[PDB]
Amino acid sequence: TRELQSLAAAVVPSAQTLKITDFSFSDFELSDLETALCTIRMFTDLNLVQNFQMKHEVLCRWILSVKKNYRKNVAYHNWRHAFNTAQCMFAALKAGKIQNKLTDLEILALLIAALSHDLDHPGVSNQFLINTNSELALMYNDESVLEHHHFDQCLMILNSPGNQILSGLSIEEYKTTLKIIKQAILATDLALYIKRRGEFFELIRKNQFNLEDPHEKELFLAMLMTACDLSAITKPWPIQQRIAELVATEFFDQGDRERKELNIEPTDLMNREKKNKIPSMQVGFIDAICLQLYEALTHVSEDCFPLLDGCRKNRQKWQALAE
């Protein structure tokens, strides 16, 4: 309470005013309340609120519950990263012109998934959970451990009294939507991105890519989730640099845990003593993970180009530091 009364009583500013259609968006200057207002605006301007009969108070409560169930002191995987992922999703749908390629249920599921995809993230990786004998890893057979947990949390909030933003869906629409949400959240496991992207890139290369094919549509949604999840890498340099510091802080904190709990020397990525490797690793990551993805997305919709453009600009800046 208190936070809900403040949020529910507010007039929600326009998308124009909130700057949320911009791929270059920064959350840094916004209060928590302002991010929640932006989130309501995203639901509203994607025609989800009236379409699916969402009650204002219920949507507000759900947003606040999602926000609360991030761990505030985890450096990167906290509410601001989920919010930014959702904002990139909104921008890709609007400015990037992806909206008209998708169904209403797909849009509904994508926005929910974007906001929910790292719920209760502990600030350590899947491999760390496996290595420290996490019950979650045992439960989920070492496969996309965190992402199954994020999905479980997503479900828990969606079912929580007063938070049921999907309660207005018909039985069939609800079934369809939950399935898309599950696949969307699981897709944010970078291991699954690496596993499946080859198929996506090949379909595009061979002029075989067809969004009307249900399997290819699912594949595309998975790739779009990754593109949004990684979108800090596309931001104007000062924004990207600030977020890269958070990513490093989280990784180095894991490395500290690995030294203590596993008695191992962390890999460079997670080793604060070797923070000098950051620029070269950023370049390597952009090349190995990011560029092909943003290239593929731009092929699907040319209006997604600014994501690719921003990624290329950051590559240049990191490479200048590395060399």
Ligand X SMILES: COc1ncc(-n2nc(C)c3cc(C(=O)NS(C)(=O)=O)ccc32)cc1Cl
Q: Which is nearer to ligand X, 134 or 254 (CB)?
A: 254
- Is residue 278 a contact partner of residue 248, using CB atoms and an 8 Å limit? yes
Q: Is residue 233 within the footprint of ligand X (CB under 6 A)?
A: yes
Number of shown-chain residues binding ligand X (CB under 6 A): 13
Partner interacting with residue 188 (select from ligand X, Zn ion, none; CB below 5-8 Å by kind):
Zn ion
Vertex 254: Cα angle to 291 and 183 (nearest 5)? 50
- Is residue 278 a contact partner of residue 67, using CB atoms and an 8 Å limit? no
Q: Which of 27, 45, 106, 118 binds Zn ion (CB under 5 A)?
A: 118
Query: Hey, which residues between 158 and 197 contact ligand X (CB under 6 A)?
Result: 190
The answer to whether the annotation marks 87 as part of a ligand binding site is: no
Q: Is residue 229 within the footprint of Zn ion (CB under 5 A)?
A: yes
* Location of structure tokens 């640099």: 241
> Kind and range of the H or E element at 163?
none
Backbone discontinuities in the chain, residue before each (C to N > 2.5 A): none
Span from 45-53, 62-70, 142-150, 227-235 in contact with ligand X (CB under 6 A): 227-235
Say how far apart CA 108 and CA 119 lie, in whole Å.
18
Q: Which of 116, 153, 240, 271 binds ligand X (CB under 6 A)?
A: 240
Partner interacting with residue 7 (select from Zn ion, ligand X, none; CB below 5-8 Å by kind):
none
Least CB distance to Zn ion at residue 320 (A): 27
Least CB distance to ligand X at residue 174 (A): 32
Q: Which of 18, 94, 15, 111 is nearest to 304 (CA)?
A: 94
Q: Which is nearer to ligand X, 81 or 148 (CB)?
A: 81
The answer to whether the annotation marks 229 as part of a ligand binding site is: yes
Report how far apart the first and last C-alpha atoms of the chain are (Å, whole number).
52
The answer to whether the annotation marks 81 as part of a ligand binding site is: yes
Q: Which of 89, 114, 230, 307 binds ligand X (CB under 6 A)?
A: 230
Buried b (16+ CB within 10 A) or exposed e, 57-93: ebbbbbbbbbbebbeeebbbbbbbbbbbbbbbbbbbb
The answer to whether the annotation marks 56 as part of a ligand binding site is: no
Q: Please write down the HEC assignment for all residues of 13-25.
A: CCHHHHCCCCCCC
Span from 85-93, 156-164, 196-204, 277-285 in contact with ligand X (CB under 6 A): 277-285
Could you say which of 77, 121, 149, 150 is catalytic?
A: 77
Least CB distance to Zn ion at residue 185 (A): 8
- Is residue 275 a contact partner of residue 247, using CB atoms and an 8 Å limit? no
Catalytic status, residue 77: yes
Indicate which residues carry an active-site annotation. Answer: 77
Residues forming contacts to ligand X in the complex (CB under 6 A) are 190, 230, 232-233, 240, 243-244, 247, 269, 281-282, 284-285
